[PDB]
């Protein structure tokens, strides 16, 4: 029983880490939308603060 429980533990850890790696990959693609939106926002704000200060 102990050895079977150990093999079962290894199998469950394998599948749980599979699930966690997919959950991390699916979160990179949310963080990148946030990052792109912030990149664009900073470019716009900076360039407007320059051009609108002139003259």
């Amino acid at each position: 029983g102990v050895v079977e429980n150990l093999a079962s533990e290894q199998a469950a850890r394998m599948v749980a880490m599979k699930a966690a790696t997919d959950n991390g990959g699916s979160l990179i693609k949310e963080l990148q939308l946030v990052y792109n939106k912030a990149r664009q926002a900073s470019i716009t704000q900076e360039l407007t603060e320059i051009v609108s200060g002139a003259a």
Binding site: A16, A19, A20, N23, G24, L27, Q45, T48, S52
Partner: protein, 458 residues
Amino acid sequence: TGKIVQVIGAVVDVEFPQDAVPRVYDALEVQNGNERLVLEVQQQLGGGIVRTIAMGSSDGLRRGLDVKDLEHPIEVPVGKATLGRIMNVLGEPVDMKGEIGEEERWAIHRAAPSYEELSNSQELLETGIKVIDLMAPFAKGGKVGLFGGAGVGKTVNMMELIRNIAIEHSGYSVFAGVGERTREGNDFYHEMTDSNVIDKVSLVYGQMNEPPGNRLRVALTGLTMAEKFRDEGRDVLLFVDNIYRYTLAGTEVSALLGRMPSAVGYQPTLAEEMGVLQERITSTKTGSITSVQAVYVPADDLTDPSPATTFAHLDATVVLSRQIASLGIYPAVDPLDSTSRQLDPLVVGQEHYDTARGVQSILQRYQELKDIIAILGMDELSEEDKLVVARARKIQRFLSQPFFVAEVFTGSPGKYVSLKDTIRGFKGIMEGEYDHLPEQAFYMVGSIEEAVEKAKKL
């Protein structure tokens, strides 16, 4: 006596004789075709030129038209005769009834009451809404603000507060609709009239159809009426339907007035424009104004300058959020961001205060776990963190309530929950005495007994 010399959008330039030039904030009058247009002067430029904003549609204005200098600011009817009637920004009647039989007219530009006159009042005010008066209770004579993006429920909440306070309250009441839908102003006008409370409410409307001058000045008119009722010795309710449109209408006009832009394109005078309004809406020794203000948050960004500079002017701030409304949990109040000046042990008592702080503590601990729950799933949690998560989700459900004004949306009938009856329920959920019920037993119910019942029926 004056001549128009420029017309840019909503701002008009007028040239007067050297010695006849109007004062700031005076009102001028033009005959725009078969119409009479009112201009309010903003600035005195050099040489008898004076720059104005048009309180009307700017189209059709030629250069060289003759404008007449009325020698006084914009003045609006005020007092008991303005009661139960709809009014323009210029104080003109806009319902189809006759003229307003007012005895007195006041200028809409005034100084705020002196520091010596203010008054302070801990008298708590009950609203039958669980979240608002657990987390962010407010007092008679205080200011409340409802912060939220677009479409999250900060008008439904204001109509429920109107229902729960302004029908069960004796004094007069005022409603200013600044830059919002005319459909909803009509719906409100008829909801009042078809229940005979209309004749104790005064209405002013500057809705979103109208050019910038109207949306810019229509808030000061509602304030002037409320201040007249305050000075008579009464106590008043003042509801402002979206105060964000009062500064956006300033941003629209600002660049044409020749002022350099500031942080995110906002006028450079944003904080002063906002303060010189928010400062005259306060209670005083002679009478009190209780207010509720809806405060739109652009792009859901709570750090935008316009919301950011408003938080300092309110006593109770109720922050609605989209990431909760999209769970179907209404009212979508965020309890980790709502707050009140009145939440002290010395004001609400140790038990109310302690329940509120425990609820914030649980929901915050639940926020901290969401990233590990998202990566590693819920089974890696300590055996007592699973319990924190279960009670946090139960508390998130129980914060929901069915409103009487939201029957049209969901069918289910409204509920009224008293304070004594909500702190008891939350103390129960926190102490663990309802751990055997399912989450859904708590969604959209009244007091805790209705949850204990709904569990029987699944």
